[PDB]
Design an enzyme around this catalytic site. Structure first.
Site, PDB file in Angstrom:
ATOM      1  N   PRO C   1       6.899   3.986  59.513  1.00 14.81           N
ATOM      2  CA  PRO C   1       7.002   4.938  57.990  1.00 14.81           C
ATOM      3  C   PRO C   1       5.937   4.715  57.051  1.00 14.81           C
ATOM      4  CG  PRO C   1       9.039   4.171  58.822  1.00 14.81           C
ATOM      5  CD  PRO C   1       8.175   3.510  59.725  1.00 14.81           C
ATOM      6  N   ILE C  64       8.468   9.278  61.945  1.00 12.89           N
ATOM      7  CA  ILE C  64       8.838   9.975  63.082  1.00 12.89           C
ATOM      8  C   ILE C  64      10.278   9.930  63.576  1.00 12.89           C
ATOM      9  CG2 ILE C  64       8.074  10.156  65.427  1.00 12.89           C
ATOM     10  CD1 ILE C  64       5.442   8.898  64.360  1.00 12.89           C
ATOM     11  N   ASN C  97      10.650  12.967  48.365  1.00 10.48           N
ATOM     12  CA  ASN C  97      10.363  14.053  49.527  1.00 10.48           C
ATOM     13  C   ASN C  97      10.384  13.248  50.651  1.00 10.48           C
ATOM     14  OD1 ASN C  97       7.861  15.470  47.326  1.00 10.48           O
ATOM     15  ND2 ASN C  97       9.665  16.270  47.929  1.00 10.48           N
TER      16      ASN C  97
HETATM   17  O1  LIG Z   1      25.147  23.206  39.458  1.00  7.86           O
HETATM   18  C1  LIG Z   1      25.125  23.602  38.134  1.00  7.86           C
HETATM   19  O2  LIG Z   1      25.845  23.628  37.501  1.00  7.86           O
HETATM   20  C2  LIG Z   1      23.446  23.584  37.771  1.00  7.86           C
HETATM   21  C3  LIG Z   1      23.285  23.699  36.099  1.00  7.86           C
HETATM   22  C4  LIG Z   1      22.000  23.663  35.659  1.00  7.86           C
HETATM   23  C5  LIG Z   1      20.810  23.232  36.566  1.00  7.86           C
HETATM   24  C6  LIG Z   1      21.270  23.051  37.907  1.00  7.86           C
HETATM   25  O3  LIG Z   1      20.223  22.731  38.769  1.00  7.86           O
HETATM   26  C7  LIG Z   1      19.423  23.646  39.449  1.00  7.86           C
HETATM   27  C8  LIG Z   1      19.915  24.870  39.459  1.00  7.86           C
HETATM   28  C9  LIG Z   1      19.095  25.888  39.901  1.00  7.86           C
HETATM   29  C10 LIG Z   1      17.758  25.160  40.800  1.00  7.86           C
HETATM   30  C11 LIG Z   1      17.612  23.982  41.039  1.00  7.86           C
HETATM   31  N1  LIG Z   1      16.520  23.703  41.807  1.00  7.86           N
HETATM   32  C12 LIG Z   1      16.310  22.244  41.922  1.00  7.86           C
HETATM   33  C13 LIG Z   1      15.528  21.901  42.606  1.00  7.86           C
HETATM   34  C14 LIG Z   1      14.639  20.733  42.895  1.00  7.86           C
HETATM   35  N2  LIG Z   1      13.693  20.929  43.604  1.00  7.86           N
HETATM   36  C15 LIG Z   1      12.818  19.998  43.965  1.00  7.86           C
HETATM   37  C16 LIG Z   1      12.359  18.980  43.356  1.00  7.86           C
HETATM   38  C17 LIG Z   1      11.380  18.020  43.641  1.00  7.86           C
HETATM   39  C18 LIG Z   1      10.779  17.892  44.954  1.00  7.86           C
HETATM   40  O4  LIG Z   1       9.944  17.325  45.542  1.00  7.86           O
HETATM   41  C19 LIG Z   1      11.198  19.031  45.647  1.00  7.86           C
HETATM   42  F1  LIG Z   1      10.685  19.345  46.785  1.00  7.86           F
HETATM   43  C20 LIG Z   1      12.147  20.167  45.205  1.00  7.86           C
HETATM   44  N3  LIG Z   1      13.390  22.152  44.026  1.00  7.86           N
HETATM   45  N4  LIG Z   1      14.448  22.852  43.324  1.00  7.86           N
HETATM   46  C21 LIG Z   1      17.177  21.247  41.365  1.00  7.86           C
HETATM   47  C22 LIG Z   1      18.173  21.770  40.354  1.00  7.86           C
HETATM   48  C23 LIG Z   1      18.545  23.196  40.377  1.00  7.86           C
HETATM   49  C24 LIG Z   1      22.542  22.952  38.261  1.00  7.86           C
HETATM   50  O1  LIG Z   2       5.741   4.708  70.504  1.00  4.43           O
HETATM   51  C1  LIG Z   2       4.534   4.404  70.332  1.00  4.43           C
HETATM   52  O2  LIG Z   2       3.455   4.979  70.549  1.00  4.43           O
HETATM   53  C2  LIG Z   2       4.270   2.677  69.805  1.00  4.43           C
HETATM   54  C3  LIG Z   2       3.329   2.273  70.011  1.00  4.43           C
HETATM   55  C4  LIG Z   2       2.957   0.925  69.401  1.00  4.43           C
HETATM   56  C5  LIG Z   2       4.018   0.504  68.683  1.00  4.43           C
HETATM   57  C6  LIG Z   2       5.370   1.049  68.554  1.00  4.43           C
HETATM   58  O3  LIG Z   2       6.425   0.349  67.676  1.00  4.43           O
HETATM   59  C7  LIG Z   2       7.425   0.982  67.271  1.00  4.43           C
HETATM   60  C8  LIG Z   2       8.587   1.029  67.982  1.00  4.43           C
HETATM   61  C9  LIG Z   2       9.726   1.702  67.419  1.00  4.43           C
HETATM   62  C10 LIG Z   2       9.462   2.645  66.351  1.00  4.43           C
HETATM   63  C11 LIG Z   2       8.156   2.666  65.821  1.00  4.43           C
HETATM   64  N1  LIG Z   2       8.133   4.038  64.860  1.00  4.43           N
HETATM   65  C12 LIG Z   2       6.781   3.891  64.438  1.00  4.43           C
HETATM   66  C13 LIG Z   2       6.751   4.918  63.256  1.00  4.43           C
HETATM   67  C14 LIG Z   2       5.602   4.996  62.264  1.00  4.43           C
HETATM   68  N2  LIG Z   2       6.085   6.251  61.710  1.00  4.43           N
HETATM   69  C15 LIG Z   2       5.096   6.790  60.627  1.00  4.43           C
HETATM   70  C16 LIG Z   2       4.350   6.077  59.868  1.00  4.43           C
HETATM   71  C17 LIG Z   2       3.611   6.602  58.926  1.00  4.43           C
HETATM   72  C18 LIG Z   2       3.673   8.124  58.599  1.00  4.43           C
HETATM   73  O4  LIG Z   2       2.903   8.665  57.770  1.00  4.43           O
HETATM   74  C19 LIG Z   2       4.480   8.635  59.327  1.00  4.43           C
HETATM   75  F1  LIG Z   2       4.560  10.056  59.322  1.00  4.43           F
HETATM   76  C20 LIG Z   2       5.324   8.029  60.348  1.00  4.43           C
HETATM   77  N3  LIG Z   2       7.089   6.569  61.863  1.00  4.43           N
HETATM   78  N4  LIG Z   2       7.570   5.957  63.069  1.00  4.43           N
HETATM   79  C21 LIG Z   2       5.753   3.253  64.694  1.00  4.43           C
HETATM   80  C22 LIG Z   2       5.810   2.214  65.642  1.00  4.43           C
HETATM   81  C23 LIG Z   2       7.219   2.093  66.200  1.00  4.43           C
HETATM   82  C24 LIG Z   2       5.508   2.258  68.985  1.00  4.43           C
END
Ligand SMILES: O=C(O)c1cccc(Oc2cccc3nc(-c4cn(-c5ccc(O)c(F)c5)nn4)ccc23)c1
Ligand SMILES: O=C(O)c1cccc(Oc2cccc3nc(-c4cn(-c5ccc(O)c(F)c5)nn4)ccc23)c1
Ligand SMILES: O=C(O)c1cccc(Oc2cccc3nc(-c4cn(-c5ccc(O)c(F)c5)nn4)ccc23)c1
Lengths: 114, 114, 114
Positions: C1, C64, C97
């Site tokens: 990860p 993954i 995220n």
């Molecule tokens: O439920 C309520 O009473 C209430 C009252 C006022 C505001 C409220 O929150 C919201 C209302 C409408 C859209 C909203 N969108 C979001 C929101 C947050 N993201 C967002 C933030 C960070 C990220 O990295 C991402 F991928 C998405 N995208 N949308 C958060 C709160 C909201 C909710």
């Molecule tokens: O399956 C393979 O190809 C492999 C090859 C060598 C070592 C190996 O060791 C593991 C065992 C179990 C889970 C494993 N998960 C991971 C692994 C890595 N990521 C990961 C890393 C960075 C990123 O930006 C991302 F999006 C995902 N997500 N999972 C790596 C190795 C693992 C796994």
């Protein structure tokens, strides 16, 4: 929403109030409440666009919805406009990645939005 | 395309010409025009890989197309090779996230690519 | 990860051991082997959350598998808890995220995981 801009422009060129301006403009463009908009500026970066070190920017906008063909065009105009006005970055040296995130994949306040 | 590499290798250890080399290598690997390749190197980072702080890198490549199983394998070999030679980072301490972006989700020059 | 945290908290406020703590808390939460967990902490950032510059954090977790509704809620509680404890960041000013990455789109060690 989350908005990030990375740029080779120096910190000195980022005006007071820029983070608020981004927050503001994004709130209205997206229709999302401003208290939920996060913004991040990263100046002084080692970057190039087309192999040139002239001012440029690499950005991201993540949102749960409010992401789409027309919307992203309107965000790109808005953001390129601000970057050109405030940071003197030419719009044709700005890239923005848009992500429509699933609510289950956005963490906030000990939980997620799903 | 957009290529970013984040690393704990210090700025002074990033050799001159590195951004240009990444630009050209990514252009030929992806077949994309070099004019449209953006590259970003972020040195001096506070990072760990497997909990240790020997040299490492966390990278991403975003492109509209030119992303896939065989291509990403080829890109990883190329990019790990470059990082190993230039930044002296072992390939087993490099991660690269690949993103196949929809044209509508990539902003540029006041619009998107869609 | 891969886990990244960007924050406006100053570098001096990031405890020694923090990268290690993140690595092993994520190893156990995700069930992934800690030798494969990469973590990246970026302090002193210019950012705002809701237009306020009080302490905040913007994070991402790429993996993954081990990504989903309940898991992401659990990761969010865990990460907000850690950020509150170590960096004194309020959970309502943390965004994370989550990305469930295809193995073909994660480069490592001259190849990908596919
Ligand atoms: O439920 C309520 O009473 C209430 C009252 C006022 C505001 C409220 O929150 C919201 C209302 C409408 C859209 C909203 N969108 C979001 C929101 C947050 N993201 C967002 C933030 C960070 C990220 O990295 C991402 F991928 C998405 N995208 N949308 C958060 C709160 C909201 C909710
Ligand atoms: O399956 C393979 O190809 C492999 C090859 C060598 C070592 C190996 O060791 C593991 C065992 C179990 C889970 C494993 N998960 C991971 C692994 C890595 N990521 C990961 C890393 C960075 C990123 O930006 C991302 F999006 C995902 N997500 N999972 C790596 C190795 C693992 C796994
Ligand atoms: O239309 C023309 O006449 C013309 C003439 C010369 C060059 C030209 O530009 C291009 C031709 C072919 C592929 C092209 N791909 C791109 C392109 C840009 N990306 C891209 C950039 C940044 C990102 O964050 C991202 F997710 C994708 N992915 N592909 C840009 C320009 C291209 C277009």
């Amino acid at each position: 929403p989350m908005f990030i801009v990375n740029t080779n422009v120096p910190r000195a060129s980022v005006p007071d109030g820029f983070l608020s301006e981004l927050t503001q403009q994004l709130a209205q463009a997206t229709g999302k409440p401003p208290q939920y908009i996060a913004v991040h500026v990263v100046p002084d970066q080692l970057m190039a666009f087309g192999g040139s070190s002239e001012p440029c920017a690499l950005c991201s906008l993540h949102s749960i919805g409010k992401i789409g063909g027309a919307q992203n065009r309107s965000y790109s105009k808005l953001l390129c406009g601000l970057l050109a006005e405030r940071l003197r970055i030419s719009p044709d040296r700005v890239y923005i990645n848009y992500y429509d995130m699933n609510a289950a994949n956005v963490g906030w306040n000990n939980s997620t939005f799903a």
